[PDB]
Amino acid sequence: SSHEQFRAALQLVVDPGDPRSYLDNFIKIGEGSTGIVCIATVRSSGKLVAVKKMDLRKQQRRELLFNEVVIMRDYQHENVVEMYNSYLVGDELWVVMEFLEGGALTDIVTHTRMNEEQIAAVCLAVLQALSVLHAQGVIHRDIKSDSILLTHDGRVKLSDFGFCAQVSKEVPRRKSLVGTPYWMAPELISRLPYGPEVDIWSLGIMVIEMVDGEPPYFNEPPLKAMKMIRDNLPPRLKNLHKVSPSLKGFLDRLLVRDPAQRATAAELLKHPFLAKAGPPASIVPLMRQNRTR
Numbered sequence: 001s002s003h004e005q006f007r008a009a010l011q012l013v014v015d016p017g018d019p020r021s022y023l024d025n026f027i028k029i030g031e032g033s034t035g036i037v038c039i040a041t042v043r044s045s046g047k048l049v050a051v052k053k054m055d056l057r058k059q060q061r062r063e064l065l066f067n068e069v070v071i072m073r074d075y076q077h078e079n080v081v082e083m084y085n086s087y088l089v090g091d092e093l094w095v096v097m098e099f100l101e102g103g104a105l106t107d108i109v110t111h112t113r114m115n116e117e118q119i120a121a122v123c124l125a126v127l128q129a130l131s132v133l134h135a136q137g138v139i140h141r142d143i144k145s146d147s148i149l150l151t152h153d154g155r156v157k158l159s160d161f162g163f164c165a166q167v168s169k170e171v172p173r174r175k176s177l178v179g180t181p182y183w184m185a186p187e188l189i190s191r192l193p194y195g196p197e198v199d200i201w202s203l204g205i206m207v208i209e210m211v212d213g214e215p216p217y218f219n220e221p222p223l224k225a226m227k228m229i230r231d232n233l234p235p236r237l238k239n240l241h242k243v244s245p246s247l248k249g250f251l252d253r254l255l256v257r258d259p260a261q262r263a264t265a266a267e268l269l270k271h272p273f274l275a276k277a278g279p280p281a282s283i284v285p286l287m288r289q290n291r292t293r
């Protein structure tokens with residue numbers, strides 16, 4: 001049947017065997033839309049790893065977990081969480097990854113104000129990842145603060161590629177409605193042909209997260225937020241008058257409704273706002289203390 005076909009297919013691109021041959025002491029530390037994140041310990045070693053566990057039977061778009069394992073195989077980039085191995089355990093896909101001990105950007109945003117040196121540092125790190133991914137035809141399609149992980153020394157890496165897509169010379173655009181409603185680009189909510197530009201819109205929403213502490217429409221039912229994103233003017237900062245002209249001029253190039261006028265990752269990397277971008281040390285205080293907005 002279709003599930004057995006897909007499971008056989010997935011078995012062909014993952015590593016063989018059971019990672020319980022070398023992983024001990026699984027503990028759930030978090031969850032996302034497709035499954036849970038555990039920490040585990042390499043047997044006979046002190047090495048800590050993160051393991052994503054996704055039940056195939058619960059997935060709305062199982063083919064995109066194929067994309068994650070395949071496209072991100074041995075992807076080595078300073079701003080991308082490293083994937084080590086993948087396995088099929090019963091009806092679950094397990095993906096063994098680097099453990100980032102600074103936590104997720106979501107936790108920083110909810111507990112503290114960030115200054116613009118810190119906001120620019122985070123944006124620089126994400127756009128360096130996206131600029132390369134987009135040049136290779138990879139659309140992430142789930143950019144948001146929960147997809148951003150930090151090290152204790154303040155490095156910033158992108159993860160959560162479970163919704164990603166590959167575009168090509170032959171098939172340069174997608175139309176699938178995929179992502180997290182409050183961060184979705186309007187042309188994607190509209191199921192119009194779209195390219196990597198949808199990640200740039202989502203980054204704009206994450207910038208609003210970093211400035212305001214939440215995305216626009218965050219307490220609205222998700223279908224209503226999607227209707228307002230699709231139909232209304234781009235959402236604005238609640239704290240509009242507390243940010244510099246540089247940051248607003250930057251944000252104005254991300255939250256552009258027309259994908260053909262929205263800035264690309266490579267263009268944004270040249271923007272004057274990112275000359276503010278602080279070094280890893282500027283991020284470190286954000287994981288150790290809180291400062292209300």
Ligand SMILES: C[C@@H]1CN(C(=O)c2nc(Nc3cc(C4CC4)[nH]n3)c3cc(Cl)ccc3n2)CCN1
Binds near residue numbers: 031081097148
């Ligand atoms: C849907 C997921 C849910 N998340 C967590 O559960 C998650 N991941 C972490 N560290 C990771 C994650 C990974 C890959 C991605 C396995 N490596 N290191 C965390 C580290 C600390 Cl200190 C505190 C809380 C954490 N929560 C954050 C990412 N988005």
